[PDB]
Amino acid sequence: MKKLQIAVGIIRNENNEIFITRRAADAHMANKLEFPGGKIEMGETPEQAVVRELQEEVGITPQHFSLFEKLEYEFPDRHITLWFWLVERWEGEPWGKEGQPGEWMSLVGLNADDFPPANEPVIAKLKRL
């Protein structure tokens, strides 16, 4: 079974809103809401991966960020380790840089059912802030 390390960024603005994108219909976890992110490549660190992934996916450079949560999840056909970084400072303005839907969502209104099930404890913990 495939094993992956994934780095994602929880992009939070001053109004307690999070920048959320929607996954493609033909991707793993198709049509789900997501924190922007992707696979940590060989020769790069988890911190370097979340910077690169957010630059690629939404056109911002995160800075002075923190590890909010790290967890493992076994999907039906793959095992992933997710690194959730809390990003509250960045250069740039996030947008759908890869043509994907993106928008700001109030933290209090997030529905964990809209996200991959691996995100359940993270969305709960975010609402605890």
Ligand SMILES: Nc1nc2c([nH]c(=O)n2[C@H]2C[C@H](O)[C@@H](COP(=O)(O)O)O2)c(=O)[nH]1
């Ligand atoms: N990008 C991203 N991927 C997630 C999240 N939650 C989650 O289980 N995943 C899974 C879906 C994919 O199997 C993998 C990410 O790989 P890609 O972003 O390259 O598709 O991690 C999330 O919040 N953001």
Ligand SMILES: OC[C@H]1O[C@@](CO)(O[C@H]2O[C@H](CO)[C@@H](O)[C@H](O)[C@H]2O)[C@@H](O)[C@@H]1O
């Ligand atoms: O691991 C993140 C953690 O480390 C601190 C320093 O104690 O931040 C450092 O690492 C971040 C991720 O690379 C950088 O963004 C930051 O500039 C650097 O100081 C903590 O602030 C953070 O919780």
Ligand SMILES: [Mn+2]
């Ligand atoms: Mn991705």
Ligand code: NA
């Ligand atoms: Na990506």
